[PDB]
């Protein structure tokens, strides 16, 4: 029973955590447009290398 | 090295000619005092004197 309770709801979790993944990636590639363009210095984009990872 | 970016130097840079253009006025202020001949020639009296 536990374990049905654990795949009746761990996909509302993972689909969560796979958003969140997504969300900080996509934050990542504005911080390094933001820094190819040259507004920000290269510690903001190793901040959000940190986040994502 | 990039720790810094290129905008924070470009308004430092623009500051550091601001600064120099500063400088320059004070300069040219300073050479408005004892003043210079602006042309070459015989001159004539001291209309004014030392003190007034």
Redesign the interface.
């Known amino acids: 029973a536990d374990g049905l309770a654990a795949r009746g709801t761990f996909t509302e979790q993972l689909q969560a955590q796979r958003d969140l993944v997504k969300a900080s990636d996509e934050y990542y590639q504005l911080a390094d447009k933001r820094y190819r363009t040259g507004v920000d210095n290269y510690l903001t984009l190793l901040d959000a290398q940190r986040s994502l990872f | 090295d990039?720790?810094?970016?290129?905008?924070?130097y470009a308004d430092a840079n623009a500051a550091y000619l601001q600064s120099k253009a500063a400088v320059e006025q004070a300069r040219i202020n300073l050479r408005y005092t004892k003043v210079l001949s602006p042309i070459s020639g015989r001159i004539g009296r001291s209309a004014v004197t030392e003190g007034a």
Do not use: E, I, R, T
């Open positions: 990039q720790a810094v970016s290129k905008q924070q």
